Amino acid sequence: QVKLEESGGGLVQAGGSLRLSCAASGRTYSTYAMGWFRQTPGKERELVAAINWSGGNTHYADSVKGRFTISRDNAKSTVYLQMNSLKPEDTAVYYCAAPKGHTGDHYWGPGTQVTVS
Please tell me what resolution, in angstroms, this structure has: 1.5
Method: X-ray
CA angle 111, 53, 102 (to 5 degrees): 75
Cα–Cα dist 37/33, whole Å: 13
Q: Strands of 68-73's sheet, edge to edge?
A: 4-7, 18-24, 78-83, 68-73
Residue by residue, DSSP assigns 33-83 as: -EEEEEE-TTS--EEEEEE-TTS--EEE-GGGTTTEEEEEETTTTEEEEEE
Overall number of domains in the chain: 1
Domain range enclosing 89: 1-117
| Amino acid identity, position 76 | K
